[PDB]
């Protein structure tokens, strides 16, 4: 297509509208109601341009560029006089009722309405009458509501309802009294409600957790990082001020998590600011905890380790690839253990083997939205991999997109698409132990134990391909529903099979692999997705090592006297009594961690590791994508006594002091080169980010905006002398504003979006090749493995049907977005949001045991009687008991385990 804007000629896409085409060309058109992910509706009337019929047309006509297709030979004018006056008048009409609130507004300096008011040139008020006002609502602990600042752009309701599928937000009232909010006071129920603080162009919806410790955007120190709260690997921009983590902003990645986070990643950063975090190396002596600096801690640990006969290491999926590799080099490959349980490790390696040996392509998170049928087996994705659930919702709405495309309706005209596709949707079949949050759009939901879900998967695979093993004992109703699933999956152009390790069953993963193989054998374009548990679960699986049970056995027999535990609390993956006994028997326990854990009471040495905000490293995605996260701030900049080093720095210095009796800390690129040298499967982490010598025309990449304030006052209460700027030898970023953050800079890692005239999250438009697409020079992060040429064989181990045994209760896992993750549940803002720990009972089982709802029952697991109140679960199959994994006292390793002596307290 060819368009002529203001006399200049441009080549654009004809399938795009004029607003997105002109924004992709660098032209500035003000807009409110349009969003790249939400489509065009024509509400705010801000994007007005003057369209002419041909080249010899002088009158023209004002049209909305978001509602006008960028067809071939289209003549428009942005800088036309009448269009400029109309856009200024739209800004003025919005300004008539807007409150005098900018100094006490959390959106100030980050506000799209401020930027568009300045951009249109409106600065003079001639409206003299009263402004309408509104009462606010309580929206829960995360989102603060200020209804006075609304411009009625309908972005919130469109995102929350049409995109995110939420039900408790809406627009109420009439003409100029339109109210956007909930029908009553209460917490927003959506798992993706936190994206409202960037979707809303004004300060109506603000980050309440940030509002507690508010600072402006220009005062922030940003870094490009990876969210640590599950395996999905969403790109984030942590922003700090005065030595504490203050906000998590969405960092655009056109391949992974483009505009949207989930609420866990956005609001579960509060564990970084906990005051009980270790900040110095601490050595115990008798009952005295003496504080050491880094050098003498390294020397004492090196001599004590050298006096030992065998040192073993226990890694964690919390830690990065570099930290786990440094531990593996410190103790040796034969003495390195992964730190997760044996069954968890087996499920993780099975998922990994399906990913890089199953011969079936695994899609990225953005690519999930293009699949025409989804089968989810055992993985409650909303509570474990929430952004995958959001992408599955988009893939489900793909059917309405298809029927609209058949009627020659443009893909950005979202209201017409939704009107054509009323309730027709792509097939979604979710299986779980109970009801999921995806059941509102699912074509079918299967509530059954994990062996029954695996049997359903194997039956689907056998009905798709007769070479797959069959399942004996299928009821005709279940057989008919299996036939419905098979007819839906066979007729799909792009079927997608999603599973994961959170179900706690190996056979569910095997059944999902068999379904994917059966769909691959029919020539379909089948994709497979595996949801891991933690941020670097797949990297720990790729690196490998022994299980936690083997390390505990080595400590308990006495073959190992020294144990180094890296970023692992050890109670989520093993029984607490066994861990306590093994660590009390061990004469030397060293714990390298950034959070106060229960195993630090028995620790001889505690090394204060850095969290993700204070460390660099690489983490491996659930789809096998290596992604580098960068340090946000120096923890020793304000508190000079703080010795909080990177975990790989601690372990490399420990290995150097053990070998040559001298301290060499490290550089990060040296550890990365060591990883790609000793481990060839992790050789792709070299290309995840450029090294520390990378420059943009000779200068580093800036971590803070150019108007960063208080450079001679922020530390003045400690010392009037300004300290040295912290040096970053690890990465290409500088801990200052003396750097580059140009949107045209040839790089992939962007710490924050800012452009002149665009101070809001709409500044991400300038950093993309086309708006809503990819980053201009490619998205960061590379895939570790490609699709294998040949797949796996059919798994013939079909599990038997679930049989309830008397006195034994099979534990059905119930994951929660707020609580099941360890670090996020340590955050103080998650304590109010997470619920009380209930235990789920079938009505028949509760009636047999004589307990109603809310009554406390006590059960013994591993010789430990704990009591929980009973919640009646209708969908849970009898013979099962429901437990919330990841909570305090209920380890995620309990999923799939049995349970004895369920007695009323």
């Amino acid at each position: 297509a060819t368009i002529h804007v203001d006399g200049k000629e441009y080549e654009v896409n004809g399938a795009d509208n004029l607003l997105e085409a002109c924004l992709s060309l660098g032209l500035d058109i003000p807009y409110f109601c349009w969003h790249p992910a939400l489509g065009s509706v024509g509400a705010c009337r801000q994007c007005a341009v003057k369209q002419y019929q041909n080249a010899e047309d002088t009158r023209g006509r004002l049209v909305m560029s978001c509602m006008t297709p960028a067809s071939d030979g289209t003549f428009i004018s942005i800088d036309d006089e009448e269009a400029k006056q109309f856009r200024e008048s739209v800004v003025e009409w919005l300004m008539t009722n807007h409150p005098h609130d900018c100094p006490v507004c959390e959106e100030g300096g980050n506000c799209h309405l401020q930027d568009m008011t300045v951009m249109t040139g409106h600065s003079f008020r001639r409206y003299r009458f009263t402004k309408r006002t509104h009462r606010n609502q309580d929206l829960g602990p995360f989102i603060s509501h200020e209804m006075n600042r609304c411009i009625a752009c309908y972005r919130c309701v469109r995102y929350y309802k049409d995109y995110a599928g939420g039900t408790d937000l809406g627009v109420y009232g009439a003409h100029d009294n339109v109210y956007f909010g909930r029908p009553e006071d209460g917490t927003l129920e959506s798992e993706f409600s936190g994206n409202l603080v960037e979707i809303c162009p004004t300060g109506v919806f603000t980050d309440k957790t940030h509002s507690e410790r508010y600072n402006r955007k220009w005062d922030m120190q940003f870094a490009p990082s990876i969210c640590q709260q599950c395996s999905i690997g969403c790109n984030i921009s942590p922003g700090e001020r005065y030595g504490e983590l203050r906000r998590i902003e969405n960092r655009y990645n056109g391949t992974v998590n483009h505009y949207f986070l989930c609420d866990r990643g956005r609001f579960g950063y509060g564990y970084v600011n906990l005051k009980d975090r270790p900040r110095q190396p601490v050595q115990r002596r008798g009952d005295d905890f003496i504080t050491l600096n880094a050098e003498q801690a390294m020397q004492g640990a090196a001599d004590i380790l050298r006096q030992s006969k065998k040192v073993i290491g226990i890694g964690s999926p919390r830690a990065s690839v570099e930290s786990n590799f440094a531990l593996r080099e410190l103790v040796g490959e034969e003495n390195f253990y992964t730190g997760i349980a044996h069954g968890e490790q087996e499920r993780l390696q099975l998922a990994l083997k399906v990913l890089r040996e199953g011969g079936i392509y695994t899609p990225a998170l953005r690519e999930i939205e293009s699949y025409d049928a989804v089968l989810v087996l055992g993985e409650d994705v909303t509570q474990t991999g929430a952004r995958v659930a959001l992408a599955v919702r988009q893939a489900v709405k793909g059917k309405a997109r298809e029927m609209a495309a058949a009627q020659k309706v443009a893909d950005w005209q979202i209201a017409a698409i939704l009107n054509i596709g009323q309730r027709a949707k792509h097939p979604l079949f979710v299986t779980n132990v109970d009801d999921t949050r995806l059941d509102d759009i699912a074509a079918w939901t299967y509530r059954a134990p994990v062996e029954d879900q695996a049997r359903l998967g194997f039956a689907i695979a056998h009905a798709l391909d007769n070479s797959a093993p069959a399942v004996d004992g299928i009821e005709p109703e279940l057989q008919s529903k299996i036939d419905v699933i098979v007819q839906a999956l066979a007729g799909a152009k792009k079927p997608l099979i999603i599973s994961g390790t959170n179900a706690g069953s190996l056979e569910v993963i095997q059944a999902a692999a068999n379904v994917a193989k059966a769909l691959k054998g029919r020539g379909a374009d089948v994709g497979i997705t595996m949801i891991a548990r933690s941020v670097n679960s797949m990297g720990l699986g790729i690196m490998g090592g022994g299980s936690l049970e083997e390390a505990l056995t080595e400590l308990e027999t006495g073959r190992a006297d020294a144990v180094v535990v890296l970023e692992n609390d050890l109670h989520r993956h093993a029984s607490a009594t066994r861990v306590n006994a093994a660590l009390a028997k061990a004469p030397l326990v060293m714990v390298v961690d950034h959070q106060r854990t229960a195993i630090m009471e028995n620790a001889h040495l505690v090394l204060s590791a850095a969290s993700f905000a204070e460390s660099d490293g690489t983490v491996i995605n659930n789809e096998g994508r290596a992604q580098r996260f960068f340090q946000v701030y120096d923890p020793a900049y304000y508190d000079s006594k703080t010795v909080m080093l990177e975990s790989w720095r601690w372990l490399h210095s420990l290995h150097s002091t053990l070998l040559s009796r001298e301290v060499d800390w490290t550089q990060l690129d040296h550890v990365i080169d060591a990883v790609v040298a000793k481990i060839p499967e992790l050789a792709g982490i070299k290309d995840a980010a450029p090294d520390a010598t990378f420059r943009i025309r000779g200068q580093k990449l800036a971590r803070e905006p150019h108007r960063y304030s208080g450079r001679t006052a922020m530390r003045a209460n400690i010392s009037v002398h300004e300290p040295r700027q912290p040096q970053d030898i690890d990465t290409m970023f500088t801990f200052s504003m003396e750097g580059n953050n140009q949107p045209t800079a040839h790089r992939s890692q962007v710490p924050f979006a800012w452009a002149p005239g665009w101070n809001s999250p709409q500044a991400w438009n300038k950093f993309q090749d086309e708006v809503g697409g990819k980053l201009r020079f490619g998205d960061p992060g590379v895939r570790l493995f490609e699709t294998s040429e040949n797949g796996l064989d059919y798994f013939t181990s079909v599990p038997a049907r679930f049989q309830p045994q008397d006195g034994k209760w099979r534990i059905a896992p119930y994951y929660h977005l707020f609580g099941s993750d360890e670090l996020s549940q340590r955050a103080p803002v998650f304590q109010s949001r997470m619920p009380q720990p209930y235990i789920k009972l079938n009505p028949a089982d509760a009636a047999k045991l004589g307990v109603n709802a809310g009554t406390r029952v006590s059960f013994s697991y591993d010789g430990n009687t704990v009591t929980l109140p009973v919640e009646i679960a209708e969908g849970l199959t009898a013979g099962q008991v429901g437990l919330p994994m990841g909570m305090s006292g209920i380890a995620p390793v309990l999923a799939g385990a049995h349970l004895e002596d369920l007695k009323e307290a």
Binding site: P103, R149, N177, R711, T712, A713
Partner: protein
């Protein structure tokens, strides 16, 4: 003899109070970013009624060039430059003036302005609709069309 100073004289910086007696500063951080030297540092805190205020407010007067850009950028007329020049010290750390060294007992050069009488954000003593040029809030459940 005492030295005469004009009322516009750019001397010692103070934080002033509203006519109701509350401190005028809403901790909006405009003065800190407008400072070319970067010698203002402050943090926003919020009271129980929702009123924004500075948790701390420090000015490095060993760095301050007394240019008055912070007073120019203040949207509440809190920070002001007053006719006073006797500010010499013995130690440079003593030129770091905290909030208790700046907050005077009166309105200073602007005797009547109150920012919170203009802002729509509700605080104690001013609910929604009681600010200047504001109508009462109309519920969407009201019977009037």
């Amino acid at each position: 003899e005492p030295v005469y100073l004009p009322p516009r004289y750019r001397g010692r910086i103070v934080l002033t109070r509203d006519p109701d007696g509350e401190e005028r500063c809403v901790a909006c951080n405009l003065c800190a970013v407008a400072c070319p030297v970067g010698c203002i540092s402050l943090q926003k805190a919020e009271t129980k009624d929702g009123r924004w205020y500075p948790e701390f407010f420090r000015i490095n007067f060993s760095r301050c060039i007394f240019c008055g850009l912070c007073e120019e950028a203040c949207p509440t007329t809190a920070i002001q430059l007053t006719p006073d020049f006797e500010m010499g010290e013995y130690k440079r750390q003593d030129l770091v003036y905290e909030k208790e060294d700046l907050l005077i007992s009166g309105p200073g050069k602007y005797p009547e302005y109150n920012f919170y009488r203009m802002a729509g954000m509700a605080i104690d003593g001013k609910d929604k609709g009681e600010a200047e040029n504001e109508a009462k809030p109309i519920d969407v459940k009201s019977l009037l069309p």
